[PDB]
Design a protein around this ligand. Structure first.
Ligand SMILES: Nc1ncnc2c1ncn2[C@@H]1O[C@H](COP(=O)(O)OP(=O)(O)OP(=O)(O)O)[C@@H](O)[C@H]1O
Ligand SMILES: Nc1ncnc2c1ncn2[C@@H]1O[C@H](COP(=O)(O)OP(=O)(O)OP(=O)(O)O)[C@@H](O)[C@H]1O
Ligand SMILES: Nc1ncnc2c1ncn2[C@@H]1O[C@H](COP(=O)(O)OP(=O)(O)OP(=O)(O)O)[C@@H](O)[C@H]1O
Ligand SMILES: Nc1ncnc2c1ncn2[C@@H]1O[C@H](COP(=O)(O)OP(=O)(O)OP(=O)(O)O)[C@@H](O)[C@H]1O
Ligand SMILES: Nc1ncnc2c1ncn2[C@@H]1O[C@H](COP(=O)(O)OP(=O)(O)OP(=O)(O)O)[C@@H](O)[C@H]1O
Ligand SMILES: Nc1ncnc2c1ncn2[C@@H]1O[C@H](COP(=O)(O)OP(=O)(O)OP(=O)(O)O)[C@@H](O)[C@H]1O
Ligand SMILES: [Mg+2]
Ligand SMILES: [Mg+2]
Ligand SMILES: [Mg+2]
Ligand SMILES: [Mg+2]
Ligand SMILES: [Mg+2]
Ligand SMILES: [Mg+2]
Lengths: 456, 455, 456
């Protein structure tokens, strides 16, 4: 069973090439799940790469309404119909005749029906839909044309179709969802089945952007500097180039300080860098940064630093990824920084957050980009990690508060360093008007990893 | 009631021999559960295993599509007509006649109907369905031919059939599921009932492969093997046991992958095949860190001795991961394997679904005399273990020890099943040639806390 | 209201003698709940003990199909019909006439209808079923014949009957269930009501075995040895004969060691013993046992030791009990051992597990059998007990890991000893190639029950 590519980033790897060739694919889902976006996108791409003639059988929508909406991603469907490359059939057993006729005058390639459920309200009685659905499918499989049929749905976790008898007739079943969890919508695609072929089971986080659908399913010894000399000395030549560094610690420990010095160092060696902040804003960052003797405003004047400030609850976790991606595909920084993940995990599913970290890490390492992700710990004085995904990070620079003689002092230590030597000493440090000052470690103190020390 | 082997791996143990002789079995479930697959496999295996006639009754789609769908597993229609061993009937009491025809025509034994739910569009009443259901099975039983019926379902945890009156008429009820939990689907088969016979109660994890369905049901020599480290072998009093399961738990960056790299290296060193299942790092990374310790993993794969199967834990489901391991070991056939790690496969997974995984790998690994070293990154570094350290025969736990404001690491053989081991928590270090197990801490107390005390 | 015995192990004590005499009993439940198994079992037993004439009114099942299925437990229904002791009436107001006629030619005793729901699909409309059900019941109560009526069900926790009007007509209501919790089926029986009589309320764990249905609703000073001399010295003459001993402790403490020495001691005094293992297999056990100088293979050669290895998730908790019972009813060991309960409680209901422990304990003590049950603790260094059923055990031999001068040493202490003196000292012990070596206790150490000790 040969498959037909749809040029839809994600769907090509989820269905292993695409959808069963010469067969009909049913795409069900609720309203605003992207049933039409996918439908025309299956034709557009098809009639832009392999130069294939595709006909669109519209029903409750006007042939200009479809083209007026496709202009949201800069798609000129008029120019498609101005070269006989796309035919829109405006709309009981005579409909297949016109489709069979049009497709004959437009050499059978890609066909989309939006929607079949619409022209079935006057029939109903469940058993009737199936009887008239089977005939349609069969009538298309005889002409051997990769057809996508749209179906309506009432529930996001209930009947597959309105009359629950379309999935049993259809050979291939793709379900588009828009689940709302904690007053936040999440678009997820899934391939229920695919007769005489293989596919990726379960649902994968996707979104609709200005390019349309966006479905989301080396290791050199090159070392880079973190901005701090002693830190690179503790890491035995600084952080690795293509690696993920983690800055875990309590509130006001110096995470954003290390991020600022990590981004500065990039711009210092004429290297581009992106800073994704979710806790503070450009205004505050510039002031805080300048207070340590760093010109963040100037760093952006050289087109070497970009600041993307936004709230962690502003958009969805499946969205935030796309922003980072598009932000990296444009500016093309050598290294990025996330401040912070703690803010991107608050009121989010433990699994939904795991898919995010895996995404950034993968993409960050896939493009050989150095990413310094910070994480704020709950207990300031310390268990381990909430979702404990410290196994994804190659380096772990944790900061801990140390109470010494009624003085709230801070300490830094390189907890982990994959395929690299590091200092296993909890060196004390302080903050000044020029960044960190890592001094000597606490040799005459015991139980330093348990908030409070002990005289020796 | 005579059994009938279907040659479906797992099913012949779940149904105790297979399905009842000259009885009608009902296989209900949702769409994509694998109802048609089972139906074909039942006849296919039955045809090329005991030269038995098979009659497939189609209803929804045509004989060509069904024949064109089995090509995904490598099954051809050479029995369809080129051997007259596969009779397909394209599609109330007139159907039964045609059924008895091909049956007595080719001295039939096996029969599959797919689907019967599609022949009850008009009849919107359960009364009619039951009446015309019983008559079918009753007829089929009069001919005493092992027939499999297929029905459709709306919910995975609701009515048995579409009209909920088919399981009561049917003698044997099989239910195929495709439950979706946490954006992840899991195919599970269960034998609801089986009249005048015994079977296994509850649902068993299965998958669909290119050999079709793979249902998953539910020695001890003193030969020792080297762990890669000499002191470690001395700590186990002769090295690791051959046909045994070793576990390495500890905080992130304790050196689990280090002990794995040496455990796999030692294999290839003695010209022994070993498989490495990574779910945290990738080949590129592992090769770098490995070489940094003075180990050439690339070379090890150049001699067809070491294999690396990197895959994100979240990529596939727990049931698929198992099949991937089994098939991977069925091809390469290593003398020992290593999983890095179990903790990476226990993330956003049910404790019951995870238990079934560890039991499988352990069982299968222990069933083929394969030495397995599974790692498990402990959540709270510097307590217990909310899982199963009872399954593992050996436990090599690594713990971080803070001494004089220095993040030092220690190792100890926590347990060694039916063997002597060192009961001392000796400090160790990592260099550019592997571990260096030094001496323990005699003048330090509460070393299990992660923070000792000057004695 | 006199009751009629059914000779069904469990149902006789649940309904206090049996079911209301001269009245009709409705048995509802889903498919494969054992509606037919019970139905014929009510006749078989009845026409095998009190020599009573019973007629079976079958519907959607053939008179040979019922007999062909009853042969799963070795029941010759043909021989029952070959002496006019059982009559099968193969199958609107004329059905009661034949039943009234047959029962007259087969002196009214035990009657079973399987099923009434079957011959009602052509009626439906809820109110119709009741009207035609009442007439049936009344027509049977007039002939005074203990009749059991089978009813179909869709839900395990929903309507009592298909039309939910059969329980209001029927005098007695028995509901058979097959609940699925965590991909595991559990058969439970219940008596909803019983007019003019008393019964046991709630549902009781049952199973179907080769004997059919299996519903599951002294104290001498005789002392026995545990295999260890010092252990018997710490128990002041060894464990009590008819008592339950518990071996709680962390992983690799020496639980299976004490079990092996406890089973060996039985075979040593020419006493039979059963070992129920769920963590290891015969292969490993024999090797581990032989490493301590115990010949487990030989112990089975004398027909004094039996090993029943099986996984704790292989079968159901309500099943595992039956296995132990049948295993003890055959071999008839003087003492048994369970290794372990921790494995039999993983992914099980806290209450469902409580009913198991009570079962083994009761049966173990009911047959005056000594049972050494082991339990693995979670924290290796220790709170108390998960489901804390240490109140069921008469003796508690807990083992605890003790870290001494960077050496992971082990310790044993007799925590409890009901109606017996015991040693209240945490004696240290080690393992060798001949079993345990209990030495002196830790006198110069403090906080030994909190993992880590303290110099004194
Ligand atoms: N240019 C755009 N940029 C971002 N999101 C867009 C853009 N255009 C549309 N969308 C999003 O995608 C949706 C359009 O999806 P589409 O029209 O295919 O829905 P549908 O599922 O076919 O709806 P219906 O059930 O009414 O037919 C919009 O509602 C909006 O959420
Ligand atoms: N080669 C293959 N590799 C992997 N999975 C496959 C392969 N071939 C088929 N499958 C899987 O098995 C499914 C086929 O099952 P099958 O065609 O029997 O469905 P079904 O349950 O009979 O559906 P229906 O409700 O339409 O009768 C596909 O949807 C896919 O999930
Ligand atoms: N100009 C300055 N001089 C001295 N110390 C400073 C100065 N500016 C900031 N600090 C110190 O360093 C800390 C700043 O660290 P930073 O702002 O990076 O916090 P953080 O660890 O990222 O915390 P969070 O993100 O939770 O607010 C302040 O709490 C203060 O102790
Ligand atoms: N010999 C046996 N050993 C063990 N279990 C058996 C044996 N025979 C039958 N069983 C079990 O008991 C069931 C038989 O129960 P029975 O036929 O009474 O069901 P039922 O509830 O009457 O079904 P229906 O609703 O279809 O009439 C089988 O499905 C199986 O689970
Ligand atoms: N070349 C090297 N030289 C010195 N020490 C090294 C070297 N490579 C690794 N290490 C040490 O070993 C640690 C990594 O060991 P390893 O990756 O096996 O640990 P792990 O517990 O499996 O980690 P993770 O939780 O990330 O899987 C580093 O943190 C460092 O302390
Ligand atoms: N031949 C031997 N010589 C010395 N010590 C041994 C020998 N065999 C086993 N041991 C020791 O005794 C322990 C065995 O105890 P046992 O196997 O009964 O463990 P357990 O407490 O039942 O643990 P679990 O059931 O959780 O695996 C081993 O961990 C080891 O310390
Ligand atoms: Mg639309
Ligand atoms: Mg900050
Ligand atoms: Mg099918
Ligand atoms: Mg690792
Ligand atoms: Mg029955
Ligand atoms: Mg044990």
């Amino acid at each position: 069973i040969a498959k037909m590519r749809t040029m839809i980033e994600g769907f090509d790897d989820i269905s292993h090439g695409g959808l069963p060739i010469g067969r009909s694919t049913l795409v069900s889902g609720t309203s605003g799940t992207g049933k039409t976006l996918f439908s025309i996108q299956f034709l557009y791409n098809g009639i832009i790469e392999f130069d294939e003639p595709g006909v669109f059988v519209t029903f409750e929508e006007t042939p200009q309404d479809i083209i007026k909406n496709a202009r949201s991603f800069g798609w000129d469907l008029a120019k498609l119909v101005d070269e006989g490359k796309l035919f829109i059939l405006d709309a009981l057993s005579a409909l297949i005749e016109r489709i069979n006729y049009a497709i004959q005058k437009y050499r059978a390639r890609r066909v989309s029906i939006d929607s079949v459920t619409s022209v079935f309200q006057q029939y109903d009685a469940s058993s009737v839909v199936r009887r008239e659905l089977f005939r349609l499918v069969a009538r298309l499989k005889q002409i051997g044309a990769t057809t996508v049929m749209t179906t309506e749905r009432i529930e996001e976790y209930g009947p597959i179709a309105r009359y629950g008898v379309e999935e049993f007739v259809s050979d291939n079943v793709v379900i588009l969802r828009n689940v709302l969890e904690g007053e936040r919508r999440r678009r997820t695609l899934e391939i229920l089945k695919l007769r005489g072929t293989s596919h990726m089971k379960g649902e994968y986080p996707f979104t609709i952007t200005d390019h349309g659908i966006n479905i989301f399913p080396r290791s050199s010894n090159v070392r880079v500097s973190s901005g701090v000399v002693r830190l690179d000395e503790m890491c035995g030549g600084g952080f690795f180039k293509d690696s993920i560094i983690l800055a875990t610690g309590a509130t006001g420990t110096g995470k954003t300080l290390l991020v600022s010095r990590f981004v500065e160092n990039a711009c210092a060696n004429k290297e581009r860098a992106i800073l994704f902040a979710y806790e503070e804003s450009r205004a505050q960052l510039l002031r805080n940064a300048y207070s340590w003797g760093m010109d963040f405003e100037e760093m952006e004047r050289q087109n070497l630093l970009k600041i993307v400030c936004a709230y962690p609850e502003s958009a969805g976790l499946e969205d935030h990824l796309q922003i980072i991606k598009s932000e990296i595909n444009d500016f093309k920084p050598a290294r990025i920084a996330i401040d912070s993940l703690s803010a991107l995990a608050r009121g989010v599913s433990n699994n939904a957050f795991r898919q995010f970290v895996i995404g950034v890490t993968g993409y960050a390492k896939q493009e050989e980009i150095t990413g310094l992700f910070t994480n704020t710990s709950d207990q300031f004085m310390h268990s381990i990690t909430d979702s404990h995904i410290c196994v994804i990070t190659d380096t772990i620079i944790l900061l801990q508060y140390v109470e010494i003689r009624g003085e709230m002092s801070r300490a830094i230590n390189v907890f982990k360093m994959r395929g690299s030597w590091h200092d296993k000493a909890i060196r004390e440090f302080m903050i000044s008007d020029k960044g960190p000052d890592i001094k000597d470690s606490f040799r005459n103190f015991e139980r330093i990893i348990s908030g409070s020390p002990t005289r020796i």
